[PDB]
Amino acid sequence: AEPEHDHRKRMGLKMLLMMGLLLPLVYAMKRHKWSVLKSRKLAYRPPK
């Protein structure tokens, strides 16, 4: 059934890293995008 219980096990290891790498890198990128929108200043200054 799971001889790759060895082999597949191996892959899982890299997975642990990929996310830990990407997941941050991903999240970053997301923030990297959204950041400006975060801080926006839009003014309600109705005339008079």
Binding site: L37, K38, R40, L42, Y44, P46
Partner: protein, 105 residues
Amino acid sequence: VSASSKWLEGIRKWYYNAAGFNKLGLMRDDTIHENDDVKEAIRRLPENLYDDRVFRIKRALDLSMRQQILPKEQWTKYEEDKFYLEPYLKEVIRERKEREEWAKK
């Protein structure tokens, strides 16, 4: 938005401190789910009003994204809230009650 209405409209005041609306400083009227009656209702809204509800709405979106809220101080003054539409709205309630009325006729 005061104690009976800070329990009850304190689902909108203390429990929209919990359910958010007024502690988010929302506009009571603005909470009505958009409907057709609501729609043209707003179409008839007053202008200076329109601006007001606008800034309110946008801001709401703003902190919403920010997932923050204004100072609890800045959190809206309880009671002390004009029912903005309700004259206008409720008027329309009579309207669609009228179109609805002669409609019934």
